[PDB]
Amino acid sequence: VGADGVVTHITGGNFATSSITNNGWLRDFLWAQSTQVITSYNTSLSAYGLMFLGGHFIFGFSLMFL
Amino acid sequence: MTQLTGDYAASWLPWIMIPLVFYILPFPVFAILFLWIQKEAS
Amino acid sequence: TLSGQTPIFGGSTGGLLKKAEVEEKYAITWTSPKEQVFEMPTGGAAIMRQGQNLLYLARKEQCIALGGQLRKFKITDYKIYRIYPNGETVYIHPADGVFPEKVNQGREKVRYNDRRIGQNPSPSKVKFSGIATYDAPNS
Amino acid sequence: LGWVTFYWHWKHLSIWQGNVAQFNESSTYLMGWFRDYLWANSAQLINGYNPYGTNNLAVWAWMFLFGHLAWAVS
Amino acid sequence: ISRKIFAAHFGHLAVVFIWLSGMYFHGARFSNFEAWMANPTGIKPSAQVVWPIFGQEILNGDMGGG
Amino acid sequence: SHTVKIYDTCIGCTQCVRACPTDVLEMVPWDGCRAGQIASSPRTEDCVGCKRCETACPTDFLSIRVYLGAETTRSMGLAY
Amino acid sequence: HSFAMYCHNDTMRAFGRPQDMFSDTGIQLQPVFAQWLQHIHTMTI
Amino acid sequence: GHSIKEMMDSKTFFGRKVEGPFNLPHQGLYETVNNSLHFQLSLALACLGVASSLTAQHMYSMPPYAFIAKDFTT
Amino acid sequence: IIKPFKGDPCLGNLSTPINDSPLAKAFINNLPAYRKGLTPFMRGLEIGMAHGYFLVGPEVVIGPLRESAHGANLSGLITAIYIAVSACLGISIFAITTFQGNPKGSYDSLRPLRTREEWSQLNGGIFLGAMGGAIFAYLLLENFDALDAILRGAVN
Amino acid sequence: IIKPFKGDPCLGNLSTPINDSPLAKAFINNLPAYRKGLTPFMRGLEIGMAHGYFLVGPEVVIGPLRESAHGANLSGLITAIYIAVSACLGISIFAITTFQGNPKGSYDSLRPLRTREEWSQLNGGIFLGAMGGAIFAYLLLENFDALDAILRGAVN
Amino acid sequence: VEVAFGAADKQILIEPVFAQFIQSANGKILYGFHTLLSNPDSIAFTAWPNHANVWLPGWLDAINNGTNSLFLTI
Amino acid sequence: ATKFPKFSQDLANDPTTRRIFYAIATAHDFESHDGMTEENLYQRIFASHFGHLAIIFLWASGILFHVAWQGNFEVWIKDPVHVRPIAHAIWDAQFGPGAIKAFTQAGARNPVDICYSGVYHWWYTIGLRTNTELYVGALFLILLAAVFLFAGWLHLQPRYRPNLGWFKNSEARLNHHLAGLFGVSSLAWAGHLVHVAIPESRGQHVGWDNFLSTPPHPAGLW
Amino acid sequence: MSISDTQVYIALVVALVPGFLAWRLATELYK
Ligand code: CLA
Ligand code: CLA
Ligand SMILES: CC1=C(/C=C/C(C)=C/C=C/C(C)=C/C=C/C=C(C)/C=C/C=C(C)/C=C/C2=C(C)CCCC2(C)C)C(C)(C)CCC1
Ligand SMILES: CC1=C(/C=C/C(C)=C/C=C/C(C)=C/C=C/C=C(C)/C=C/C=C(C)/C=C/C2=C(C)CCCC2(C)C)C(C)(C)CCC1
Ligand code: SF4
Ligand code: SF4
Ligand SMILES: [Ca+2]
Ligand SMILES: [Ca+2]
């Protein structure tokens, strides 16, 4: 909140218009909000970028047994 | 534009061939293709 | 034929369907010296009577899953029939009166191969022939 | 062939865009395969139809999502 | 059976208390609970510092207040 | 309508007959065992195909097979 | 009626028909019984 | 000409007594390939999935068609 | 109380307040699919007319033509023509293919149409039923501005 | 090859590739005049609808009213009413007058409608058939400017 | 983990020096193995008894131009 | 006890819905069909290769017909780098106005598809320059697909079915597939390149009424 | 210069020749 009273949200009213198509969940939620875990190398969020990619391993690894 | 036109020759021909082979003819075709699948032998 | 009183069962949903009226239907028949309660193969629980019992089942695996239950109630006298819709009651279990676990005489070696299992012929021996490789009249 | 044609595409998408030093420095670890190839190049694809419009990739943005449905239903 | 159930709950409750004494000990010795209680807006909540080996001290990001 | 063949490696332990849920197998007399028995399958039209007789055979590379063939209404277990 | 209405909206948005899909601007599906409980729990203070 | 049935069973190499082609027993392989329609089909798909990789590995490096190098998507 | 289905505890149904009520038994057995003493054409003519009448509904107000008025009622009628041609296609296809030696079992209720002359007569009913109803609800929708007036006294 | 008609060399026909093919026998014996297992109403309802649909054709584009648009489709419908009233008049007149002791011969194929209750049911089919088809092709022709738009995406 | 933990210089980078030798044995003069069609004083470049490599000066203009996909930089 | 599938009688008496699906994925396995010998085996392999070659020649005649009719091969051939090819046209009657406009690309007056197959670059190289040589090549492949549907019908007639000794003639098939199928038809393609594709890449137009007079070389035929 | 209006109709009747001959083959292979 600023010094007038209006609120600028984190994604900005994005759920009302774009969460009704599941291309909007792909583009506006999974692609657009993972710019903090993709570009999290060389920084202090570096372990979250490794657990993100170590997570995708164990899912695809699960499909050997399933 | 706001309409499906055709600059090519015989542009009336997709106007009838696209409803024909996709939603007018297949339910006849799926009827004929069902009458020999479930046809009895004697 | 068949006769007996049905057990006290309050109706179910896993019972007979339109197959039992049109194709075939099975009937197990036992007698009980007690008013005991057993588990139905069609889901639930029923109280068998003290006389001749009679229960209509839909397929033969339901009768012998029930027949394997009565043998734990020390009831080993059950007869399983198979009722075609024209009324023809054949009698199928136990066929000779004796249970198929213990041996009786006069019974035949039916579907028996006189070889080891590992010396069945190759499927290229029986190519473009009517027989399969496990029929194989040589040995 | 999702490793052959992922490497044909990214080696050539770095030559055609001139950025040959993008593949040559970030294909040696699996984050750059995920950040610079999959996440980066799907920007112009999933925007085949935004809430504000629709371009000529609106059928490739739909087939891309028809193919996630056919994969998941498998 | 029920004596095995009752005695295994006690060994489970003695496992929660190990973990609950690890959350209060990490807030005691390895945290900025002093700096966070003074300013709960600018200082970020942090426990669980990381050892200086294998170059993983890049995960020790700045939490406000040194 | 499956095909339950029985080979001469049998030992007459009657374990396949007790494991059959549909009474396909039965014990007939024989000469090549100490029990003097061998299994036979006269009610192979009642073969439900479930291969539970095959898990009970203790002879190595078992003496009974179920060859899953042309399945019918009583060889598929349909109560409807 | 929950997922294939996300595939109806996904096809109308790609077709360039944003007035035909289940939006707040197109075919509105309002939570009538859940917008009413938000009205009750602020009129009972 | 050559008889393929003779090339399988030939056990004489200028007076020597080799077991066949490359001193390896290839006898009975003529009537194994010729009667099997799956031996002939597997050899024809292995030799067509090499010519289909070789199509792909060569047509991007040595393009045979006019201005197909400057059409990046085809 | 819930007793077994018509006194048979071995049958796979229950004699429940929904299927064996006095009310819901006298409502289901008086619907035209089950009403006693009807020719199969009059069964299908009443089943069809109740279906052509409502099936033009969901396309003239939320269809692709809802923004106009004269073209909205065409796209709702054209829908119910195609729903009821392809459904009355599927029951001529049903009776050709299920009556070949197994007339729904020669050996029974909830399906009292077991003859193939009782089904070819039914298919003629549902066709002329579901397109009299599709036109009656089309003539009551393209003439809605003239029917709002006679149901409000605006025609004096 | 052309063999005699069903093995009889004395009968006056030939078993020719046109009448005794596999294809043209399975097309003619599946037309609604010859399809097996149809009530005579459903024979006539399908025969009629295929005829009311095209008979409005040759009068709305080369008739006397072709210069207009709304009056063209009336003169094409009015034609197919009069063609199909006077044809379904002529087959009630046919069955009254040929079923009096000679039911197309009591003693046979290509004419399987030999009963006079199988012909009075047929006449009810061709009437309601050839005027459902005459209206469906009338409602698809007076609404042609609204159907050119929905088959070209002009309605968004 | 090395790029994630800051030290991108601690990556194990094996230079593929056996397939960089193939390009340098066909005409790619970028690496500098300087052998066998990268060395113009060789037996394979000149073909000393006949000198009939009429294909060769046109080929080396293709492999050493950096605008085609013929033997890309490895 | 149904008629379908007619090739296996152990599946026609299936009482379940397994009969439909297992008759799809067994219909081409001719070696397991009921009542088949080895001579009748090969004569249905042989006559279904004919019905498969006709699918290839009708598919290649749908590439040519749809860029002669709906493509821009006359427009693309004048600036083949700065214009996109056209595969065919769009007739999806449920487009909105935002998808008619978005798909009206590459200088078309209708919605179209940009061809990513590369057949425009193939026909520019081998010497096709107009939309009529594409059309009469599409009408020829229709008729070429008709002589392969007719040949497949021919070799099931009992006077024309080959015997098992002809199918197992492995040395005579290798002679004609190397010399005739791979040798002559690669000799013939060097005939097209020398006569048509090389002179049409140099400006002069060589067609069917032109190739018998103008030789492809000034030192020609000698 | 695209093809004429008649050349489309010429192609539709030429392709009835492999449309009918595809039916002669599909039934001689005995579906
Ligand atoms: C010269 C005579 C001749 C010719 C032209 C053919 C032609 C053909 N035959 Mg036949 N055949 C012949 C004689 C001939 N045959 C004889 C005498 C016999 C008696 C034994 C047979 C027995 C026979 C049978 C049983 C069958 C055929 C079949 C075929 C067809 C193959 C299908 C196809 O698309 O091929 C391929 C088409 C190409 C254009 C080849 C290009 C693709 C290849 C894979 C790449 C070539 C590149 C090369 C190999 C690369 C390496 C070169 C090397 C120097 C490095 C084809 C049209 C099949 C058929 O009926 O189809 C209808 C089949 O079932 N033939
Ligand atoms: C097999 C190649 C092939 C393919 C993939 C297509 C594909 C297409 N055509 Mg077609 N067409 C073809 C050959 C082909 N064509 C030939 C040779 C002709 C000349 C007669 C035509 C004449 C034609 C016209 C007039 C039109 C199309 C149109 C179309 C489009 C929609 C389909 C449709 O409604 O029309 C129906 C298709 C036909 C009337 C003829 C197709 C039948 C061909 C001859 C053979 C295909 C059968 C195939 C071999 C079956 C095997 C596959 C099976 C085993 C699964 C579609 C992209 C429409 C369009 O332009 O869209 C905008 C359009 O109206 N085509
Ligand atoms: C369950 C129930 C319910 C419901 C019901 C419903 C669901 C409804 C409905 C309804 C409906 C849905 C109705 C309808 C109808 C109809 C009609 C009334 C019709 C008609 C018609 C006509 C009259 C036609 C005519 C014609 C012809 C014949 C042809 C020519 C043309 C014309 C058009 C003239 C309730 C809860 C309420 C209660 C009770 C029970
Ligand atoms: C020989 C042949 C041929 C031909 C065919 C033809 C001749 C055609 C046609 C056609 C036609 C000619 C068709 C038709 C149709 C129709 C329809 C589709 C109908 C309808 C209808 C309806 C739906 C109606 C309705 C209604 C009613 C009932 C009443 C009320 C009103 C209304 C209107 C609603 C060819 C060569 C091609 C091929 C094959 C063989
Ligand atoms: S099959 Fe098993 S149970 Fe039967 S005789 Fe052999 S070993 Fe005994
Ligand atoms: S398949 Fe089942 S029913 Fe048949 S013999 Fe084996 S265990 Fe018994
Ligand atoms: Ca709309
Ligand atoms: Ca006039």
mmCIF file of C-alpha atoms in Angstrom, chain G:
data_model
loop_
_atom_site.group_PDB
_atom_site.id
_atom_site.type_symbol
_atom_site.label_atom_id
_atom_site.label_comp_id
_atom_site.label_asym_id
_atom_site.label_seq_id
_atom_site.Cartn_x
_atom_site.Cartn_y
_atom_site.Cartn_z
ATOM 1 C CA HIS G 1 -18.685 -29.007 -15.609
ATOM 2 C CA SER G 2 -15.483 -27.882 -14.124
ATOM 3 C CA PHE G 3 -12.687 -29.005 -16.411
ATOM 4 C CA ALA G 4 -14.424 -28.927 -19.766
ATOM 5 C CA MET G 5 -15.509 -25.376 -18.978
ATOM 6 C CA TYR G 6 -11.786 -24.640 -18.829
ATOM 7 C CA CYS G 7 -11.500 -26.228 -22.281
ATOM 8 C CA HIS G 8 -14.417 -24.164 -23.541
ATOM 9 C CA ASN G 9 -12.705 -20.983 -22.359
ATOM 10 C CA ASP G 10 -9.418 -22.186 -23.809
ATOM 11 C CA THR G 11 -10.965 -22.616 -27.241
ATOM 12 C CA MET G 12 -12.926 -19.353 -27.245
ATOM 13 C CA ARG G 13 -9.842 -17.403 -26.205
ATOM 14 C CA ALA G 14 -7.841 -18.977 -29.035
ATOM 15 C CA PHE G 15 -10.637 -18.465 -31.571
ATOM 16 C CA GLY G 16 -10.708 -14.765 -30.799
ATOM 17 C CA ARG G 17 -14.162 -15.008 -29.217
ATOM 18 C CA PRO G 18 -13.729 -13.546 -25.718
ATOM 19 C CA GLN G 19 -17.472 -12.865 -25.427
ATOM 20 C CA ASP G 20 -18.393 -16.551 -25.749
ATOM 21 C CA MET G 21 -16.370 -17.893 -22.818
ATOM 22 C CA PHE G 22 -17.155 -18.198 -19.112
ATOM 23 C CA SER G 23 -15.626 -14.898 -18.017
ATOM 24 C CA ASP G 24 -16.726 -11.989 -15.916
ATOM 25 C CA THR G 25 -17.045 -10.283 -19.315
ATOM 26 C CA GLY G 26 -18.624 -13.137 -21.283
ATOM 27 C CA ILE G 27 -21.025 -15.746 -19.903
ATOM 28 C CA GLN G 28 -20.945 -14.973 -16.188
ATOM 29 C CA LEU G 29 -21.144 -17.815 -13.661
ATOM 30 C CA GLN G 30 -21.347 -16.073 -10.395
ATOM 31 C CA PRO G 31 -21.068 -17.852 -7.046
ATOM 32 C CA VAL G 32 -24.551 -16.795 -5.992
ATOM 33 C CA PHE G 33 -24.617 -18.772 -2.733
ATOM 34 C CA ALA G 34 -21.026 -17.915 -1.780
ATOM 35 C CA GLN G 35 -21.285 -14.209 -2.539
ATOM 36 C CA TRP G 36 -24.288 -14.260 -0.230
ATOM 37 C CA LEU G 37 -22.429 -15.752 2.724
ATOM 38 C CA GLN G 38 -19.838 -13.029 2.292
ATOM 39 C CA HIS G 39 -22.748 -10.623 2.671
ATOM 40 C CA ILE G 40 -24.063 -12.344 5.811
ATOM 41 C CA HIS G 41 -20.758 -12.441 7.676
ATOM 42 C CA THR G 42 -20.297 -8.672 7.303
ATOM 43 C CA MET G 43 -23.886 -7.684 8.151
ATOM 44 C CA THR G 44 -23.719 -9.543 11.486
ATOM 45 C CA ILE G 45 -21.056 -7.394 13.136
#
